[PDB]
Amino acid sequence: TDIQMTQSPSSLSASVGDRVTITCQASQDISNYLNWYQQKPGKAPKLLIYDASNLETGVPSRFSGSGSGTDFTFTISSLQPEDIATYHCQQYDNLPYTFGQGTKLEIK
Amino acid sequence: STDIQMTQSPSSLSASVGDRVTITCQASQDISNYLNWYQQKPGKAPKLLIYDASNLETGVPSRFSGSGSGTDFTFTISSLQPEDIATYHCQQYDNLPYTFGQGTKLEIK
For residue A17, the domain's CATH number is: 2.60.40.10
Best interface-test mutation with B: which of A33, A37, A51, A89 has the largest number of B CBs within 10 A?
A37
For residue A42, what are the CA distances in angstroms to A24, A64, B106? 25, 25, 12
Closest CA to A97 of A3, A19, A31: A3
Q: Print the domain residue range for B20.
A: 1-109
Structural domains of chain B, count: 1
Min Cα separation A56/chain B (Å): 8
Phi, psi of A81 (to 5 degrees): -55, -40
The CA-based dihedral angle spanning residues A67, A88, A7, B39, taken in that order and rounded to the nearest 10 degrees: -140
Amino acid at B5: Q
CB contact under 8 A, A44 and B11: no
Q: Which residues of B touch A10 (CB under 8 A)?
A: 43
Experimental method: X-ray
Rounded Cα gap, residues A47 and B11, in angstroms: 20
- Pairing between strand B87-92 and B35-40? antiparallel
* B58: CB partners within 8 A, 6+ apart: none
Rounded Cα gap, residues B81 and B18, in angstroms: 6
CB-defined contacts A:B, below 8 A: 53
